[PDB]
C-alpha cells in the first residue's frame, strides 16, 4: 500500500578516495576520485583539473587501486565494493566514445565472517604478482593475478594476528612479502611474512619482529633505492630494514594525529603527511652511500609546510602541487613553494572544491520569496565549519564560514533571525582556564552574553578535572537572516553541551521563545545524569533567560506538540504545558523507552524513534491527558532518523544505510494484532541519513495535484547527498518496477553488479529483496541512452497512457514520463 | 567516552559503526545493572527442560516441562495463561521451537520418542518420526526456515533430518552416545553443528556428506558437551561443556579456539542441563552459575547468579542476582528485541525486566 520513489537532488560531494596514475593513457597523469557511488576521472594539467568522465556505480566503492600487470602498456584498475563485488577494469577510449571494460569480475564474499573494526583494507604487490585484502579478522585474502582468474577466485591464509592495523607489501623481495603492524597483549609489534603461492601459506619473513611505539598506526612501504619500511605513530617516526633501525621523535607532530600519506618523490626521499588539524608536513629521508653502491638511510627530518583543510587523503600531483581530498570540508588544490610567504607558510591554495558534508542538521525557509523554499544546513566541522544556504537555479550555495562546529538550527520569524548551536575546541592555558586554538564565530560575534545560570551549580557534588584535558565550548549564535552576520553569541557553562534547540510559541503566551536542551558532560560517565531545558526570549539584540527546568539526565529531544512541549530526557518522555506564570508543568509521561532520540509529530499523533527499540507510534489523548501505546515495529532497528509520511505511513533510516517504511496492520482482527506495525517497504539506500524534513526546492506549480507522485520528504546525508522520497500509486509502482527490470536487462553494469543485488536490503543478520521503493536515479538514467537503445528497452512494452485502455509503449512516451519525474527535484 | 559526542562523530562519519556498538553495549550493561528488581514469577508442576520465545512479540513466551506439559504465557494480559498437559511421568518434552509460519503452532520432541508438530489447542497435526522401540528416544531439536529443514537428536548417537513435508533422506548415525544439542545457521543454510557425549563436537555440511562420518570438521574437548550454539551473524560458535569451561570457535579455522571463558556449570542427574546463549544484537554471552568447591576460584565469594560476559575479549562485565530466587538458573534466554530476559529454574519461571519509572497525573 506504501509505494515509494526516491531521487537524488544533489549527488554526494564528499570524497571517499583519490588516486593518481596513468590510467586513461600512458602520457597523462590522471586523478581518479571516489564519492561513495560516483567515480570521477580527471587529467591533471598545468592550470588545474580537466573533467574527463563521471560514472555511477551500483555499489559503495571501498577500494580503488591502480596497477599494471606485466605486459600491460598502462595501468589497470582494481575496485572492491562494500558488498564485496570485486572487479579489474581497463580504460578504453576511441574518438568521443569512452568505455570501461571489465577485465575481471567476481563476488569475493565469504559465507560467514564478521567485517572488521578497522574496515576494509586492500593492497597490491609492487610487482603485481597478487592482490592482498584484509576483509575479515584472522584471514589474509590473496587473489593471484593470473590472466585466467576472470572470476576473481581467491584463497584465504590464516593470520595468527587477529587485530591488524595496517599492512603493505615490501620492495626488493624475490617473493611477495607483507609487513604489517598489529596489537596484542604484549603491546604493538611489526612483523613480516613471505607469501608462498605453491603452499598458499606464509613463510618466515626476511627480518624478525620488532617492537615499535605503542601508538604506531601506519605503515609505508618505501620503494628502491631505500627499501625497508616506515612506521608512523603519534609522537615518533621509525624506519626498519633488517639490521637497520632509525627513529626520530620531533615534538612538532605530537599535537595532532597524522592520518594520511602519499609518496612525493619517486625515489622515496620525501613524503607528505597531513593531520587532523590540517597541518601539512614533509618527512625527508637523508641518504647514506655504501661501498657496494647501495643506499641506506642516514637520517630523518620533519618539516612543517603549513596548514590546509582537514585532509581525508593526499596526492602529490606535479609541479609542487598537491591535491588534498577532504570528507569533512572542501577539497583543495594547493601549491608548495620552496620559500615561505609573509606569514611564514610554504603552502598556497590554488583551488577549492565544495563539500557540504557532514550535513548534521538543516531546515527549510522561504528565505527570498514566499513559497520558494531554500534549505539552510549546518555544514562542515571544525575550522572548515560553515552554514550553507542552498537554492535552485544548477543550484546556488551561499557559504557562511563559522570556523567551528554547528550542530542544530531553527528559524524564529518574529525576530527575523536564526538560532544556531555551535561548539569549538579549546586547550588548557598556562595558568587559568582554557584558551582557544584559533578564532571562530563564537569569538567574533557582534555581542555576547555568558550564561549566569546557577540552577544546579549549587547542591551538586562537583567532579574534579585533570590537566591536559581539552574542553569544548558551546554557544548559541543569533544570526541575521538577511546578512548572516553573527548578531549574538551566548556561551554556556564550562563542560555544558548544548544539544538541541527549537523556536516555537506555546499556550496562550504571545511571546516567541528559543528553547534549548543541554547536558553536563564529563568524560568518565557512562550516561548523562543532568540536564536543563532553558527558555530564552530575544528582544533588544540580546537573549534573556526567561525560564529553566532541571532534569536528572540529558535532554536529547524537544518538540512543539499542539501548543505543548514534548521532551525526551534519558529514559522518560514528558509533556509540559506552558503556564500563565511562565513555567513548565507536567501533563503526562511515557516511560517504555531506553532512550528516545528522535521525535516528529503530526496532529495528535507522535512518532518516537528509539535508540534500540526502534520506533513507537503513540497518540496523545486530550480528554484523558495521558499517552496510549498505539503500535510498535517489533523488528529491531538502530535508527538514525525518522519521518511521518502520513497518519498511516512511517519513514525510518537505519545505521546500515537502508531506509524502510512501516504501516499499521490493515489485516488485524485483534487489539494485539492491531498493535503490530508492519515493515511494508525496504530499500538499500547506500547513505547514512542524519535528518528528514518536509519541504521542497522546486517552484510550486500552484494546483500541482493530480500528479504521478504524492508527498515530498527531503533528507540529508553525511556525504552531502540530498535526496527526496515521495509516494506512488500502485499502477505507477508496477510500471516503474517493470521499467527497472527491463533496464537491468539492457544496461551494462560496471563490474557486472545486478541492480537488484545492489539495492537489496542487507545486514549481518538478514538478506531480503527490496520492496516498495523506486530508485529514481535508475529511472532517470533512461534518458541518456541512444534512441535505438530506448526502443529496445521499450520494445514489446504494454502501456496505458493517461486514462484508458492499454497499448504498446513507444520510447517517446517513456521519455515524457521520466522527464515529468525529473521536475520533482 | 560519553556517547553523545561519539554519536555526533558518527553523524560526521568520523567514528565507525562498531565503535557505536561498543558504546551502546556499555550502555545496555549499565541499565542491565538495574534489572535487579524481579518483575514477575510464574509456577507450574515438574521441572523445566526447554524454553522458547515468540519471535515477533516481546511479552509472549513458550516453555516445556519435565512431564510433557507445555505452557504459553503473555505478560500484561492477565488472561490466565494457556496450558496443555501430557502423560506426566515419562513424556518429558526436551525440544521446543516456534513455527516460523503459523505462530500458533509449535514443533516438539518428547521422551516418548515422537518428533511432532502440534497446535497450542492440543490437536496434533503430524508426527514426523518415531522410535517404535523404547529405551531409544529423542533429546534435542531445532529448525531452519530459510531452507525449511528440521533436525533432531537421539540418546544413542544418530541424528535425523527432515523436510517440512516429510521426505527423510538422512538418519545416518553420527556419534557413539547421546546428542544433547544440535543447531543450524540462520544466515547461511548449509552448514550444521552437533554436540555429543563423545567429548567431540562436529560441524557438518548437510548437502555434501552421506558417508557415515565423512564429516567436514571435528573439534575435540576434554569433557562432554551440553550445548553448541551458533551466532546470529554466523561466524562465531559457542560451546559449553559439563565440568568447567566455555569455548569460542570462529569461522576462521574451526579447529583452534579464540578464547576460553572458564565458568562452572557442573552436571547433575536431576538438574536440567545448562545452556549458554548469545544476545542477538551485541557480542555478549549470558550463562547460569553452579558453584563448585573444587574449582580454582579467583573470587573469594562464590554465589549462584547469572553472569554476563563479553564474547571477543574473555572477561566478565555483569552479574544479576535477586533474593527470593536463590535457586539455580538452569535456563536463561533474552528476547530477540534486546529489552527483556526470561529465566527457567526448577519449578519456577522468572522475569527480570526493568523496574520503576516516574508517573503521570
Distance CA(A406)–CA(A475), nearest Å, equals 9
- List residues bridging with A4 in a β-sheet: A727, A773
Q: What is the DSSP letter of B274?
A: P
Asked if B213 is an interface residue toward chain A (Cβ–Cβ < 8 A), one would say: no
| Cα A162 to Cα A187, A213, A228, B250, B280, distances in angstroms | 14, 19, 24, 11, 23
Chain B hits for A497, CB-CB cut-off 8 Å, are: 4-5
Among partner residues A112, A137, A327, which is closest to B13 by beta-carbon distance? A327
Distance CA(A570)–CA(A332), nearest Å, equals 42
Distance CA(A337)–CA(A334), nearest Å, equals 10
Asked if A521 is an interface residue toward chain B (Cβ–Cβ < 8 A), one would say: yes
CA A148 vs. chain centroid, Å, equals 37
Distance CA(A286)–CA(A269), nearest Å, equals 7
Q: Which helix (H) or strand (E) holds A131?
A: strand A130-134
Distance CA(A332)–CA(A352), nearest Å, equals 4
Chain B hits for A765, CB-CB cut-off 8 Å, are: 186-187, 232-233
Distance CA(B324)–CA(B305), nearest Å, equals 12
Chain A hits for B187, CB-CB cut-off 8 Å, are: 112, 764-767
C-beta neighbour count of A522 within 10 angstroms: 14
CA B262 vs. chain centroid, Å, equals 19
Distance CA(A370)–CA(A374), nearest Å, equals 10
- Measured in angstroms, the CA of A523 and the nearest CA of chain B are apart by 6
Resolution in angstrom units: 3.9
Distance CA(B262)–CA(B285), nearest Å, equals 13
Distance CA(A632)–CA(A635), nearest Å, equals 9
Distance CA(A640)–CA(A411), nearest Å, equals 23
DSSP for A531-563 reads EEEEEEEEETTEEEEEEEEEESS-EEEEEEETT
DSSP-derived pairing of the beta strands A709-717 and A722-728: antiparallel
For the domain bounded by B39-361, which CATH number is listed?
Answer: 2.130.10.10
Q: Can you tell me which residue has the cell 521441572?
A: B47
* A554 Rama sector, left if φ>0, alpha if ψ -120 to 50, beta otherwise: beta
Asked if A634 is an interface residue toward chain B (Cβ–Cβ < 8 A), one would say: yes
Q: Can you tell me which residue has the cell 609487513?
A: A179
Chain A hits for B16, CB-CB cut-off 8 Å, are: 117, 119
SS (H, E, C) A145-168: CCCCCCCCCCEEEECCCCCEEEEE
Q: What is the DSSP letter of A442?
A: G
Nearest to A823 by CA among A12, A9, A55: A9
- Measured in angstroms, the CA of A328 and the nearest CA of chain B are apart by 7
For chain A, the farthest-separated pair of C-alpha atoms sits apart, in whole angstroms, at 96
Q: Do B233 and A764 touch (CB under 8 A)?
A: yes
Domain residue ranges in chain B: 1-38, 39-361
Asked if residue A578 lies in contact with residue A561, where contact means CB atoms within 8 angstroms, the answer is no
Asked if B357 is an interface residue toward chain A (Cβ–Cβ < 8 A), one would say: yes
CA A595 vs. chain centroid, Å, equals 24
- Set of cell numbers at residue A454: 546557577
Asked if B145 is an interface residue toward chain A (Cβ–Cβ < 8 A), one would say: no
Chain A hits for B235, CB-CB cut-off 8 Å, are: 112-114, 136
How were these coordinates obtained? cryo-EM
| Cα A721 to Cα A358, A433, A443, A717, A718, distances in angstroms | 10, 40, 31, 5, 7
- Set of cell numbers at residue A340: 615561505
Name the phi and psi angles at A213, rounded to 5. Answer: -60, 150
Distance CA(A141)–CA(A134), nearest Å, equals 6
Q: Which long-range contacts (CB under 8 A, 24 or more apart) does A185-194 make?
A: A187/A211, A187/A214, A188/A212, A188/A213, A188/A214, A188/A215, A188/A216, A190/A216, A190/A219, A190/A229, A190/A231, A190/A240, A191/A161
Angle subtended at Cα A181 by Cα A179 and Cα A186, rounded to the nearest 5 degrees: 130
Q: Which helix (H) or strand (E) holds A584?
A: strand A584-590
Asked if residue A183 lies in contact with residue A216, where contact means CB atoms within 8 angstroms, the answer is no
Asked if B232 is an interface residue toward chain A (Cβ–Cβ < 8 A), one would say: yes
Nearest to B97 by CA among B139, B130, B137, B144: B144
The Cβ-side half-sphere exposure at A480, using a 13 Å CA radius, reads: 10
The residue length of chain A stands at 825
Nearest to A405 by CA among A384, A391, A429: A384
Using only C-alpha atoms, chain A has a radius of gyration, in whole angstroms, of 29
- Set of cell numbers at residue A83: 558488498
DSSP-derived 3-state class of residue A500: strand
Q: What is the DSSP letter of A745?
A: H
- Set of cell numbers at residue A44: 591533471
Distance CA(A617)–CA(B308), nearest Å, equals 32
Q: Do B281 and A626 touch (CB under 8 A)?
A: no
Instruction: Give all strands (DSSP E) within A413-528, no chain letters.
Output: 417-428, 434-436, 471-480, 486-491, 496-504, 513-520
Distance CA(B175)–CA(B210), nearest Å, equals 14
CA B108 vs. chain centroid, Å, equals 15
Angle subtended at Cα A344 by Cα A338 and Cα A345, rounded to the nearest 5 degrees: 60
Q: Can you tell me which residue has the cell 506504501?
A: A2
- List residues bridging with B85 in a β-sheet: none
- Distance spanning both ends of chain A, measured CA to CA: 24
- Set of cell numbers at residue B352: 527480570
- Set of cell numbers at residue A106: 567476481
Asked if residue B93 lies in contact with residue B74, where contact means CB atoms within 8 angstroms, the answer is no
Angle subtended at Cα A66 by Cα A65 and Cα A68, rounded to the nearest 5 degrees: 140
Nearest to A513 by CA among A485, A543, A541, A481: A543
Decide: residue A75, CB within 10 A, 0-12 exposed, 13-18 middle, 19+ buried. Answer: buried
The residue length of chain B stands at 361
Asked if A586 is an interface residue toward chain B (Cβ–Cβ < 8 A), one would say: yes
Asked if A764 is an interface residue toward chain B (Cβ–Cβ < 8 A), one would say: yes
DSSP-derived pairing of the beta strands A676-684 and A626-633: parallel
Using only C-alpha atoms, chain B has a radius of gyration, in whole angstroms, of 21
Beta-carbon contacts of residue A46 (< 8 Å; ≥ 6 apart) = A319
Among partner residues B12, B57, B339, which is closest to A718 by beta-carbon distance? B12
C-beta neighbour count of A154 within 10 angstroms: 19
Q: Do A497 and B4 touch (CB under 8 A)?
A: yes
DSSP-derived pairing of the beta strands A386-392 and A395-401: antiparallel
Asked if residue A677 lies in contact with residue A632, where contact means CB atoms within 8 angstroms, the answer is yes
Chain A hits for B39, CB-CB cut-off 8 Å, are: none
Alpha-carbon torsion (B288, B294, B296, B299), positive or negative: positive
For residue A197, what are the domain limits? 3-353
Distance CA(A565)–CA(A507), nearest Å, equals 10
CA A348 vs. chain centroid, Å, equals 28
Q: Can you tell me which residue has the cell 528488581?
A: B37
Range 183-202 of B in CB contact (< 8 A) with A: 185-188, 191
Alpha-carbon torsion (B105, B111, B112, B114), positive or negative: positive
Asked if residue B160 lies in contact with residue B115, where contact means CB atoms within 8 angstroms, the answer is yes
Among partner residues A111, A571, A611, which is closest to B188 by beta-carbon distance? A111
Distance CA(A648)–CA(A2), nearest Å, equals 9
Beta-carbon contacts of residue A701 (< 8 Å; ≥ 6 apart) = none
Please count the helices (runs of H) and the strands (runs of E) in chain B: 2, 27
Beta-carbon contacts of residue A51 (< 8 Å; ≥ 6 apart) = A40, A42
Q: Do B234 and A358 touch (CB under 8 A)?
A: no
Q: Do A636 and B2 touch (CB under 8 A)?
A: no
C-beta neighbour count of A782 within 10 angstroms: 24
Distance CA(A813)–CA(B39), nearest Å, equals 64
Alpha-carbon torsion (A366, A367, A369, A370), positive or negative: positive
For chain B, the farthest-separated pair of C-alpha atoms sits apart, in whole angstroms, at 70
Name the phi and psi angles at A783, rounded to 5. Answer: -75, -10
Q: Can you tell me which residue has the cell 517552484?
A: A699
Distance CA(B142)–CA(B147), nearest Å, equals 13
Domain CATH number, residue A32? 2.130.10.10
- Measured in angstroms, the CA of B33 and the nearest CA of chain A are apart by 12
Q: Can you tell me which residue has the cell 542544530?
A: A408
DSSP-derived 3-state class of residue B105: strand
| Cα B109 to Cα B92, B116, B118, B141, B342, distances in angstroms | 9, 6, 10, 7, 21
SS (H, E, C) A6-59: EEEEECCCCCCEEEEECCCCCCCCEEEEEECCEEEEEEECCCCEEEEEEEECCC
Nearest to A82 by CA among A42, A131, A135: A135
Nearest to A327 by CA among A42, A44, A579, A688: A688
Q: Do A589 and B360 touch (CB under 8 A)?
A: yes
- Distance spanning both ends of chain B, measured CA to CA: 37
Range 361-400 of A in CB contact (< 8 A) with B: 381
**Cis, bond preceding A358 (omega within 30 deg of 0):** yes
Angle subtended at Cα A81 by Cα A79 and Cα A87, rounded to the nearest 5 degrees: 40
Amino acid at each position: 500500500m506504501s509505494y515509494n520513489y526516491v531521487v537524488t537532488a544533489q549527488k554526494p560531494t564528499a570524497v571517499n578516495g583519490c588516486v593518481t596514475g596513468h590510467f586513461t593513457s600512458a602520457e597523462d597523469l590522471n586523478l581518479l576520485i571516489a564519492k561513495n557511488t560516483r567515480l570521477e576521472i580527471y587529467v591533471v594539467t598545468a592550470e588545474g583539473l580537466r573533467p574527463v568522465k563521471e560514472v555511477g556505480m551500483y555499489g559503495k566503492i571501498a577500494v580503488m587501486e591502480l596497477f599494471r600487470p606485466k605486459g600491460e602498456s598502462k595501468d589497470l584498475l582494481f575496485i572492491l565494493t562494500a558488498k564485496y563485488n570485486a572487479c579489474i577494469l581497463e580504460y578504453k577510449q576511441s574518438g568521443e566514445s569512452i568505455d570501461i571494460i571489465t577485465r575481471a569480475h567476481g563476488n569475493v564474499q565469504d559465507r560467514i565472517g564478521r567485517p572488521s573494526e578497522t574496515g576494509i583494507i586492500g593492497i597490491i604487490d609492487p610487482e603485481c604478482r597478487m592482490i592482498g585484502l584484509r576483509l575479515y579478522d584472522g584471514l589474509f585474502k590473496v587473489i593471484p593475478l593470473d590472466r585466467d582468474n576472470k572470476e576473481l577466485k581467491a584463497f584465504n591464509i590464516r593470520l595468527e594476528e587477529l587485530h591488524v592495523i595496517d599492512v603493505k607489501f615490501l620492495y626488493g623481495c624475490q617473493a611477495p612479502t607483507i609487513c604489517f603492524v598489529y596489537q596484542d597483549p604484549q603491546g604493538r609489534h611489526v612483523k613480516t611474512y613471505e607469501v608462498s603461492l605453491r603452499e598458499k601459506e606464509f613463510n618466515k619473513g626476511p627480518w624478525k619482529q620488532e617492537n615499535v611505539e605503542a601508538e604506531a598506526s601506519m605503515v609505508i612501504a618505501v620503494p628502491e633505492p631505500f627499501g625497508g619500511a616506515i612506521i608512523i605513530g603519534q609522537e615518533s617516526i621509525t624506519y626498519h630494514n633488517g639490521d637497520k633501525y632509525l627513529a626520530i621523535a620531533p615534538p612538532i607532530i605530537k599535537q595532532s594525529t597524522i592520518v594520511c600519506h602519499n609518496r612525493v618523490d619517486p625515489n622515496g626521499s620525501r613524503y607528505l603527511l597531513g593531520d587532523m588539524e590540517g597541518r601539512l608536513f614533509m618527512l625527508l629521508l637523508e641518504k647514506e652511500e655504501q661501498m657496494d653502491g647501495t643506499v641506506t638511510l642516514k637520517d630523518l627530518r620533519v618539516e612543517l609546510l603549513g596548514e590546509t583543510s582537514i585532509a581525508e587523503c593526499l596526492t602529490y600531483l606535479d609541479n609542487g602541487v598537491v591535491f588534498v581530498g577532504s570528507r569533512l570540508g572542501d577539497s583543495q588544490l594547493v601549491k608548495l613553494n620552496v620559500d615561505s610567504n609573509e606569514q611564514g607558510s610554504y603552502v598556497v591554495a590554488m583551488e577549492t572544491f565544495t563539500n557540504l558534508g557532514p550535513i548534521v542538521d538543516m531546515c527549510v525557509v522561504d528565505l527570498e520569496r514566499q513559497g520558494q523554499g531554500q534549505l539552510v544546513t549546518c555544514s562542515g566541522a571544525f575550522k572548515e565549519g560553515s552554514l550553507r544556504i542552498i537554492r535552485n537555479g544548477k543550484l546556488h550555495i551561499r557559504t557562511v564560514p563559522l570556523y567551528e562546529s554547528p550542530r542544530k538550527i531553527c528559524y524564529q520569524e518574529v525576530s527575523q533571525c536564526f538560532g544556531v548551536l555551535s561548539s569549538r575546541i579549546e586547550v588548557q592555558d598556562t595558568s587559568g582556564g582554557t584558551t582557544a586554538l584559533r578564532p571562530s564565530a563564537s569569538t567574533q560575534a557582534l555581542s555576547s552574553s555568558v550564561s549566569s545560570s546557577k540552577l544546579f551549580s549549587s547542591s551538586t557534588a562537583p567532579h574534579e578535572t585533570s590537566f591536559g584535558e581539552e574542553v569544548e565550548v558551546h554557544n548559541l549564535l543569533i544570526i541575521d537572516q538577511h546578512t548572516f552576520e553573527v548578531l549574538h553569541a551566548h556561551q554556556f557553562l564550562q563542560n555544558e553541551y548544548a544539544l538541541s534547540l527549537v523556536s516555537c510559541k506555546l499556550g496562550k503566551d504571545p511571546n516567541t521563545y528559543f528553547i534549548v536542551g543541554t547536558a553536563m558532560v564529563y568524560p568518565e560517565e557512562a550516561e548523562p545524569k543532568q540536564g536543563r531545558i532553558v527558555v530564552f526570549q530575544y528582544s533588544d539584540g540580546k537573549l534573556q533567560t526567561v525560564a529553566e527546568k532541571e532534569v536528572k539526565g540529558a535532554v536529547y529531544s524537544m518538540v512543539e506538540f499542539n501548543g505543548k512541549l514534548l521532551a525526551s530526557i534519558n529514559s522518560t518522555v514528558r509533556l509540559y504545558e506552558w503556564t500563565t506564570e511562565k513555567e513548565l508543568r507536567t501533563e503526562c509521561n511515557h516511560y517504555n523507552n531506553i532512550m528516545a532520540l528522535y521525535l516528529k509529530t503530526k496532529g495528535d499523533f507522535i512518532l518516537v524513534g528509539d535508540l534500540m527499540r526502534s520506533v513507537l507510534l503513540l497518540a496523545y489523548k486530550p480528554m484523558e491527558g495521558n499517552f496510549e501505546e498505539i503500535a510498535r515495529d517489533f523488528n529491531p532497528n538502530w535508527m538514525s532518523a525518522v519521518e511521518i509520511l502520513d497518519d498511516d505511513n512511517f519513514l525510518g533510516a537505519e545505521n546500515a544505510f537502508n531506509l524502510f517504511v512501516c504501516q499499521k496492520d490493515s489485516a488485524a482482527t485483534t487489539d494485539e494484532e492491531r498493535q503490530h506495525l508492519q515493515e511494508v517497504g525496504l530499500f538499500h539506500l547506500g547513505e547514512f541519513v542524519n535528518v528528514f524534513c518536509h519541504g521542497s526546492l522546486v517552484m510550486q506549480n500552484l494546483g500541482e495535484t493530480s500528479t504521478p507522485t504524492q508527498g515530498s520528504v527531503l533528507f540529508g546525508t553525511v556525504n552531502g547527498m540530498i535526496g527526496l522520497v515521495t509516494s506512488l500509486s500502485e499502477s505507477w509502482y508496477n510500471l516503474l518496477l517493470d521499467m527497472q527490470n527491463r533496464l537491468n536487462k539492457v544496461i551494462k553494469s560496471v563490474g557486472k553488479i545486478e541492480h537488484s543485488f545492489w539495492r537489496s536490503f542487507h545486514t549481518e543478520r538478514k538478506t531480503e529483496p527490496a520492496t516498495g521503493f523506486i530508485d529514481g536515479d535508475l529511472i532517470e538514467s533512461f534518458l541518456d541512452i541512444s534512441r535505438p537503445k530506448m526502443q529496445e528497452v521499450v520494445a514489446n512494452l504494454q502501456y496505458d497512457d493517461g486514462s484508458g485502455m492499454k497499448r504498446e509503449a513507444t520510447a517517446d512516451d517513456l521519455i515524457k514520463v521520466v522527464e515529468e519525474l525529473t521536475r520533482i527535484h | 567516552r560519553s556517547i553523545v559526542r561519539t554519536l555526533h562523530q558518527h553523524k560526521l562519519g568520523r567514528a565507525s559503526w562498531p565503535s557505536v556498538q561498543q558504546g551502546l553495549q556499555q550502555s545496555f550493561l549499565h541499565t542491565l545493572d538495574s534489572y535487579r528488581i524481579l518483575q514477575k514469577a510464574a509456577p507450574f508442576d515438574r521441572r523445566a527442560t526447554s524454553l522458547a520465545w515468540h519471535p515477533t512479540h516481546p511479552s509472549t513466551v513458550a516453555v516445556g516441562s519435565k512431564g510433557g506439559d507445555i505452557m504459553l504465557w503473555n505478560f500484561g494480559i492477565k488472561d490466565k495463561p494457556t496450558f496443555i498437559k501430557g502423560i506426566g511421568a515419562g513424556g518429558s518434552i526436551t525440544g521446543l521451537k516456534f513455527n516460523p509460519l503459523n505462530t500458533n503452532q509449535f514443533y516438539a520432541s518428547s521422551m516418548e520418542g515422537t518428533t511432532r508438530l502440534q497446535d497450542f489447542k492440543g490437536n496434533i497435526l503430524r508426527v514426523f518420526a518415531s522410535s517404535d522401540t523404547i529405551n531409544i528416544w529423542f533429546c534435542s531439536l531445532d529448525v531452519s526456515a530459510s531452507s525449511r529443514m528440521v533436525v533432531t537428536g537421539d540418546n544413542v548417537g544418530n541424528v535425523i533430518l527432515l523436510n517440512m513435508d516429510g521426505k527423510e533422506l538422512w538418519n545416518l548415525r553420527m556419534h557413539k552416545k547421546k546428542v544433547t544439542h544440535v543447531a543450524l545457521n540462520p544466515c547461511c543454510d548449509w552448514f550444521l553443528a552437533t554436540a555429543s557425549v563423545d567429548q567431540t563436537v562436529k560441524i557438518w555440511d548437510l548437502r555434501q556428506v552421506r558417508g557415515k562420518a565423512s564429516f567436514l570438521y571435528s573439534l575435540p574437548h576434554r569433557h562432554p558437551v551440553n550445548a553448541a550454539c551458533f551466532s546470529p551473524d554466523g561466524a562465531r560458535l559457542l560451546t559449553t561443556d559439563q565440568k568447567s569451561e566455555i569455548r569460542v570457535y570462529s569461522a576462521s579455522q574451526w579447529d583452534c579456539p579464540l578464547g576460553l571463558i572458564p565458568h562452572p556449570h557442573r552436571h547433575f542427574q536431576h538438574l536440567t542441563p545448562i545452556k549458554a546463549a548469545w544476545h542477538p544484537r551485541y557480542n555478549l554471552i549470558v550463562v547460569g552459575r553452579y558453584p563448585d568447591p573444587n574449582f580454582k576460584s579467583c573470587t573469594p565469594y562464590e554465589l549462584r547468579t547469572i553472569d554476563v560476559f563479553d564474547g571477543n575479549s574473555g572477561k566478565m562485565m555483569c552479574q544479576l542476582y535477586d533474593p527470593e530466587s536463590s535457586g539455580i538458573s538452569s535456563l536463561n534466554e533474552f528476547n530477540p528485541m534486546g529489552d527483556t530476559l526470561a529465566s527457567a529454574m526448577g519449578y519456577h519461571i522468572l522475569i527480570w525486566s526493568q523496574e520503576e519509572a516516574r508517573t503521570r497525573k
